[PDB]
């Protein structure tokens, strides 16, 4: 009955192939071709924050649009103060592999991870004074590549062993574990309202997951390679990913298929971040080639370059009031765009 | 500025003490070690004393940081970038016993270890003499023609495992080591210092 | 637990000398700024002195500068030189972490008692004594001679409560904020130069005496201290 499974579930993806192209009546260009293009978009930095010594591999920006933690391979995870470039913190972690971090949304925690497979909970508020290790979540079998924060108690995370999980920081056991991918599961983003997210996989292909139930609403495939980054756009009805393959893709949650994609002709490197703005027009994305493009997302038309660093740029971020744009690089220099 | 000031004094303490630790941490030199399974990389890992093992020791005032990443169970390429500033690779090959040599292949040809110079153990040698002494050469490889001698055959499993790389910026150290020495760290050293004079050189503009 | 224990009171004769130690224990003591807060028997608090964290700068009040000399094993240290019979109080430890977004002076420690046989911003606490009633509001204010309000947008204006035979406690920092541990039926307002702090919902555990402070400019100076008495 192998050969009839095969076959049954090779009908169920013409099924769904049809299903799909049946609603694509107009183009996403043909439809925002009548609306007036952003113009060019320069943006000056504003601040640099020289601390780090190696390579930057992670940055979030908290919840109140000033604080800031960016990890490195130096085994420090620093909280800055974007207004006044002072750091506020400065946490030492046990294993300087690290491929992630977090801030949680009240601003009590930060989360860490990387080659060590354990997502590491840090306490900021302590009454001793110091910052303390609240947590280390341990039961993932490869290397750990993106955590978010639901609330102060829950934290999904992303692992290489091609599976996302669901935690508990208060017992430290696995509320759900989400299983489907076939590759190393690179990126994440959790929704605006919190009960569903994306992740990103290196099969060229981003599973609609949701934190209650644990089961893949959706699979998006259009990409040609491993997916690098992903990030939801602001109403929560769509998302961007960028992938090794020298372009982005937008796909659109109801219409269950991508919309737009955004390539030139003179990119070669891979998307390293995505990043949206606070209304949804620009599409920040982070890339190999030491430079960061700024994309017309309702056009598909590049509106800027935000060049000035001098390696491939690993992170980017969008305050939640959207006045600046941070983005981390492995020259080990942050700098804030605005 | 009322308290501020305290905060920008404790932000300037805070970064002396980052200072102080990237200098104390710049004393070290990293390698990264790989081979294939059961090549010999625990036994002299531990001959100078699950995600990724990290061993240190020290020899003639140098800390020798050593990463082994063969635990991990996951492609390489999305996670091989972290080690691109390691001074050298160990690659560990096990003589008495084709994977070996793709893994080389690949790992030598890398794109973020164009620069970086490996250094070649064969381990097993009594082994390897053993199995010649009991059986040819030529099983593992079908088109080898000569000898069948130790030390032919030998040489011509390193001209094998040299010719698998093309940069003209970086050097392959082959050793061989029988296993019953405790040699290897002198080699790991020399090695080393001749990488080092050899970046360095090359960054006076004078290479 | 956060424990701040002092030593090193008794009966000095005029003229002389004294050495008053601050054993601390329980937090990270190497990162905190430590203050010195005296209170003489009758009277109100008064700022004495401020070591910052690492021995970076040191401050005095104007009635000490001289006189005295401030150091921090984890122990703080306080080298009292000829005491007048004005310097007859009792001494406090305070610990004040500084970095953005932090609660300083939130532990206050118990206390030894000594008995020996011009551009300073002045803050004026209008009412003394207000009769008050379990259950009931309670609204104290206090005023600044100078604007509390900062370019920055924060106001330093800091709400500590005496209970009787108690040490201080911090109930409001920068005069919106509430401190660690407060219940939420402390509210702090005001503008620039007027300070309000509203109690609702009055228990029998809120009476005590409750002073004021200033964090704009060293020295800082602390209110007359508003006591409430139940009925």
């Known amino acids: 009955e192998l050969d009839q499974l095969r076959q049954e579930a090779e009908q169920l993806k013409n099924q769904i192939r049809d299903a799909r192209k049946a609603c694509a009546d107009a183009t996403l260009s043909q439809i925002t071709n009548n609306i007036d293009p952003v113009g060019r978009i320069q943006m000056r930095t504003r601040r640099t924050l020289r601390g780090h010594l190696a390579k930057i591999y992670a940055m979030h920006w908290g919840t109140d649009s000033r604080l800031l933690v960016s990890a490195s391979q130096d085994g420090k995870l620093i909280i800055w103060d974007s207004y006044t470039t002072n750091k506020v913190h400065a946490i030492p972690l046990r294993s300087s592999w690290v491929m992630t971090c977090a801030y949680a949304p009240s601003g009590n925690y930060v989360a860490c991870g990387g080659l060590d497979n354990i997502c590491s909970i840090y306490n900021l508020k302590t009454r001793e004074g110091n910052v303390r290790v609240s947590r280390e979540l341990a039961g993932h079998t490869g290397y750990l590549s993106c955590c978010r924060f639901l609330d102060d108690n829950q934290i999904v995370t992303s692992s290489g062993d091609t599976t996302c999980a669901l935690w508990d920081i208060e017992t430290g056991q696995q509320t759900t574990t989400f299983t489907g991918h076939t590759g190393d599961v690179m990126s994440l983003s959790l929704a605006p309202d919190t009960r569903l997210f994306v992740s990103g996989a290196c099969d060229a292909s981003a599973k609609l997951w949701d934190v209650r139930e644990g089961m893949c609403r959706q699979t998006f495939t259009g990409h040609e390679s491993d997916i690098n980054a992903i990030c939801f756009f602001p109403n929560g009805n769509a998302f961007a990913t960028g992938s090794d393959d020298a372009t982005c893709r937008l796909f659109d949650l109801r219409a269950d298929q991508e919309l737009m994609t955004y390539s030139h002709d003179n990119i070669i490197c891979g998307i390293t971040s995505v990043s949206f703005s606070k209304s949804g027009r620009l599409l920040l994305a982070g890339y190999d080639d030491f430079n960061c493009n700024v994309w017309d997302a309702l056009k598909a038309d590049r509106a800027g370059v935000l060049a000035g660093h001098d390696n491939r740029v690993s992170c980017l971020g969008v305050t939640d009031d959207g006045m600046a744009v941070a983005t981390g690089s492995w020259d080990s220099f942050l700098k804030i765009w605005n | 500025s009322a308290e501020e000031r305290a905060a920008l004094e404790r932000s300037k303490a805070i970064e002396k003490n980052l200072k102080e630790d990237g200098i104390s941490a710049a004393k070290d030199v990293k390698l990264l070690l790989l081979g294939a399974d059961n090549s010999g990389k625990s036994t002299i890992v531990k001959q100078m004393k699950t995600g990724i093992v990290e061993t240190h020791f020290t020899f003639k005032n140098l800390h020798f940081r050593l990463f082994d990443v063969g635990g991990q169970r996951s492609e390489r390429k999305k996670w091989i970038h972290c080690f691109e500033d390691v001074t050298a690779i160990i690659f560990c090959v096990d003589l008495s016993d084709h994977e070996s040599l793709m893994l080389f292949d690949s790992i030598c040809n890398n794109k973020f270890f164009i620069d970086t110079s490996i250094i070649l153990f064969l381990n097993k040698k009594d082994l390897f003499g053993e199995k010649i002494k009991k059986s040819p050469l030529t099983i593992c490889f079908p088109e080898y023609t000569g000898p069948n001698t130790y030390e032919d055959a030998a040489a011509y499993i390193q001209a094998q495992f040299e010719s698998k790389n093309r940069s003209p910026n970086k050097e392959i150290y082959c050793h061989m080591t029988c296993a019953t020495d405790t040699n290897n760290a002198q080699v790991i050293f020399d090695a080393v210092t001749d990488i080092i004079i050899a970046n360095n050189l090359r960054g006076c503009g004078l290479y | 637990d956060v424990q701040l224990v002092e030593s090193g009171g008794g009966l000095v004769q005029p003229g002389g000398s004294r050495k008053l130690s601050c054993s601390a224990s329980?937090?990270?003591?190497?990162?905190?700024?430590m203050h010195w807060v005296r209170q003489a028997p009758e009277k109100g608090l008064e700022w004495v002195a401020y070591?910052?964290?690492?021995?970076?700068?040191?401050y005095y009040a104007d009635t000490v500068k001289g006189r005295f000399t401030i150091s921090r094993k984890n122990t703080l240290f306080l080298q009292m030189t000829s005491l007048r019979s004005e310097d007859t109080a009792m001494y406090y430890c305070?610990?004040?972490?500084?970095?953005?977004?932090?609660?300083?002076?939130?532990?206050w420690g118990q206390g030894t008692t000594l008995t020996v046989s011009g551009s300073d911003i002045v803050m004026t606490q209008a009412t003394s004594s207000v009769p008050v009633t379990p259950g009931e509001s309670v609204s104290i204010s206090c005023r600044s001679s100078?604007?509390?309000?900062?370019?920055?947008?924060?106001?330093?204006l800091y709400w500590f409560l005496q209970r009787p035979g108690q040490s201080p406690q911090l109930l409001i920092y920068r005069m919106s904020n509430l401190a660690s541990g407060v219940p939420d039926r402390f509210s702090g307002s005001g503008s620039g130069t007027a300070f309000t702090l509203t109690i609702s919902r009055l228990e029998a555990e809120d009476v005590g005496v409750y002073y004021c402070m200033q964090h704009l400019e060293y020295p800082l100076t602390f209110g007359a201290g508003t006591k409430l008495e139940l009925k």
């Open positions: 305070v610990r004040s972490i500084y970095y953005y977004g932090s609660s300083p002076f939130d532990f």
């Open positions: 100078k604007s509390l309000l900062h370019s920055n947008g924060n106001t330093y």
């Open positions: 329980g937090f990270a003591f190497s990162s905190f700024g």
């Open positions: 070591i910052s964290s690492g021995s970076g700068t040191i």
